[PDB]
């Protein structure tokens, strides 16, 4: 039974939503993308409604739309954004072009918190703890996120954190899409081992995010790929002989060998006056060699989080099963698969 919809132009975009969702208001004046705060009169909840941007604009984006909806429907964890509702104004597959997702309103993202002049170390402890708690869960499902960054972490007024945006997430595999992550948070093996990174790229991003929380500044704000690589090497040091041999790009190896030799910095001399345990965790997160990087599960046991760590309150997931995602499909197949997932969504009990 299709609800009554109504239509409204919001910042040069036509939103069409069920009448239960009232007083749509773009968060931050529309600077955070296509997300509106609303009041759900059916539940009395304050919700955030995301209108997916151009979900079927290409084969790649259609695929990403399907993966994100499937993952969001599969996952159930306090530090991962959860679906209250999923809808489309379309009355049939034939006119299906728009997807809307609904969750609890959170009210800020980590970019706001980075600017907070009253941020304490305990706050950093609690925020990074929750990112890692969500990441332990995600990785245990054999999901890889691939786009962690401050704007993809929502924080509510109780400093409860949820990972947003699974648009680039997928089931992990030996070979995956090459150009992923946002540049300032992109792990170096994404550039050095084209299409053959693994879940530790997400730990790199968390390291970059923690550093930004501690200092108030982007850790590696590169303006291009060469710039980005050099900014990283200035901190973690240029690779030695045994590590070069794991770099699959001969052009990258050749370029790196042309640079001045750089040692690993003492992070205690970068993050001045930070908790020594925070510096220690950062040293274990921001390591060039992917195989020596700390895991999410290991990081939750780090002494930095002793106030919050509870090994029986850090659950793992049921592993995610990749239904139709292993082949190259046309947009119309991705649309039909996504339509079926919209029509079959069952809202959680209140």
């Amino acid at each position: 039974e299709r609800p009554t919809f109504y239509r409204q132009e919001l910042n040069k975009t036509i939103w069409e939503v069920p009448e239960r969702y009232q007083n749509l208001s773009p968060v931050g004046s529309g600077a955070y993308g296509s997300v509106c705060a609303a009041f759900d009169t059916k539940t009395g909840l304050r919700v955030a409604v995301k209108k997916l941007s151009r979900p079927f604009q290409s084969i790649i984006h259609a695929k990403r739309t399907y993966r994100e909806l499937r993952l969001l429907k599969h996952m159930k964890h306090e530090n991962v954004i959860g679906l209250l509702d999923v809808f489309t104004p379309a009355r049939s597959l034939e006119e299906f072009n728009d997807v809307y997702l609904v969750t609890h309103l959170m009210g800020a993202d980590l970019n706001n918190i980075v600017k907070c002049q009253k941020l304490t170390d305990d706050h950093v402890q609690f925020l990074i703890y929750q990112i890692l708690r969500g990441l332990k869960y995600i990785h245990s499902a054999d999901i890889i996120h691939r786009d962690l960054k401050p704007s993809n972490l929502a924080v509510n007024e109780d400093c409860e954190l949820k990972i947003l945006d699974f648009g680039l997430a997928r089931h992990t595999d030996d070979e995956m899409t090459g150009y992923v992550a946002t540049r300032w948070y992109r792990a170096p093996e994404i550039m050095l081992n084209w299409m053959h990174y693994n879940q530790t790229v997400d730990i790199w991003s968390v390291g970059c995010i923690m550093a930004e929380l501690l200092t108030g500044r982007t850790l590696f704000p590169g303006t291009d790929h060469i710039d980005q690589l050099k900014l990283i090497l200035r901190l973690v040091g240029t690779p030695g002989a045994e590590l070069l041999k794991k770099i699959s790009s001969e052009s990258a190896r050749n370029y790196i060998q042309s640079l001045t030799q750089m040692p690993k910095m003492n992070f205690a001399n970068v993050f001045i006056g930070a908790n020594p345990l925070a510096v220690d965790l950062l040293e274990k997160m921001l390591v060039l060699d992917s195989d020596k990087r700390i895991t999410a599960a290991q990081a939750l046991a780090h002494a930095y989080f002793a106030q919050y760590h509870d090994p029986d309150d850090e659950p793992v997931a049921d592993p995610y099963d990749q239904s139709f995602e292993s082949r190259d499909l046309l947009i119309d197949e991705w649309k039909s698969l996504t339509y079926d997932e919209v029509i079959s969504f069952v809202p959680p009990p209140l």
């Binding site: 090459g178 150009y179 790929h225 790009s249 052009s251 990258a252 370029y255």
Partner: peptide, 14 residues
């Protein structure tokens, strides 16, 4: 799909 990183690396050396 093309690798944009190798392009920049080969140029930076050149």
């Amino acid at each position: 799909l093309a690798n944009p990183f190798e392009n920049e690396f080969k140029k930076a050396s050149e």
